[PDB]
Amino acid sequence: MRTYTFDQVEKAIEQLYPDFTINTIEISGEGNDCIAYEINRDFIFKFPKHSRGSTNLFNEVNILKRIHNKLPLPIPEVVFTGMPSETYQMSFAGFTKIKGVPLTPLLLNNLPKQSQNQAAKDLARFLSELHSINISGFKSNLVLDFREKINEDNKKIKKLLSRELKGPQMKKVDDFYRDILENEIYFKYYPCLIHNDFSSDHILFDTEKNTICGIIDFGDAAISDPDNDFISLMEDDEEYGMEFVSKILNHYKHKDIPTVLEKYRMKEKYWSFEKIIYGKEYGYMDWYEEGLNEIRSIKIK
Ligand SMILES: Nc1ncnc2c1ncn2[C@@H]1O[C@H](CO)[C@@H](O)[C@H]1O
Ligand SMILES: [Cl-]
């Protein structure tokens, strides 16, 4: 992973946009892929920590352009873009800053009921529109076929762990994957554009009006199961929990809530495997070793 000096950030931007005066530059936050810099309190510029992150940033730029002006909450607008090199598909990008603070579960549960309900309705409406966007222009690098993802994961896990697990432990890994694969419910969805990291840290809130004022972080958006964007809201402490999320599902007119729950339960168990792979694909040994220990020692449905 690479980090950046403030000077490097300013030089990179100067190279392609020499007429843009930078007065203020501060780190705004940081995810798996990118470090974010707030520039002139007007813009957020993302700089990739690594190649994989850069490809995600390239995709985020492409998606945000394709959906500009289509959705009923504000989303970042692409204003500046960097260049490809032998290392990065895109060396940086600058988006409009969306104002607001994350709608944390704490903040949400302290709102008056009327604003909680309005927030659930505004989310459903946003997701209905997002999930309705015409996907036919989106190439295969943006398509995340869940069955292919599960089979490809099964193969990455075997390749990574065949020297790390004993016989019965790998047996339990095969039983687990066989069980998921034989359940049709995970695989029969109508593919749609999904945010795919749809959680409270990415939902921005205006406390003067008590209304959601933006959705951010599209670097994982992909063509996939629309249910992914309800399950990412559901974790009982970390996120909103079921009472709130069923108001979103009801506003969205979801026809099959129990399927949403079943997907959520499966994704809870699936986390150990995600941790191994993420471990290696994003260079986080801590996750790797945590996921390995869980496969080694603990029951998995
Ligand atoms: N366009 C934006 N407007 C407001 N905050 C942003 C924006 N983009 C990124 N951020 C912040 O920097 C982090 C990493 O992208 C985000 O989760 C958020 O904290
Ligand atoms: Cl469209």
Substitution site in 27, 35, 44 for ligand 1 pocket (most atoms within 8 Å of beta carbon): 44
Is residue 282 within 8 A of residue 276, CB to CB? The reply is no
Is residue 89 within 8 A of residue 53, CB to CB? The reply is no
Nearest-ligand number for the alpha carbon of 192: 2
Q: Is 173 in the pocket of ligand 1 (CB under 6 A)?
A: no
Distance from residue 101's CA to the centre of ligand 1 (Å): 10
Atom of ligand 1 nearest to the CA of 98: 3
CA distance 41 to 119: 26
Residue positions forming the annotated binding site for guanosine? 98, 217
Distance from residue 134's CA to the centre of ligand 2 (Å): 4
Domains of the chain: 6-96 (3.30.200.20), 100-301 (3.90.1200.10)
Distance from residue 133's CA to the centre of ligand 2 (Å): 4
Distance from residue 185's CA to the centre of ligand 1 (Å): 34
Q: Is 217 in the pocket of ligand 1 (CB under 6 A)?
A: yes
Cα 271 to chain centroid, rounded: 15
Q: Is 216 in the pocket of ligand 1 (CB under 6 A)?
A: yes
Distance from residue 181's CA to the centre of ligand 1 (Å): 36
Residue nearest to atom 13 of ligand 1 (CA): 29
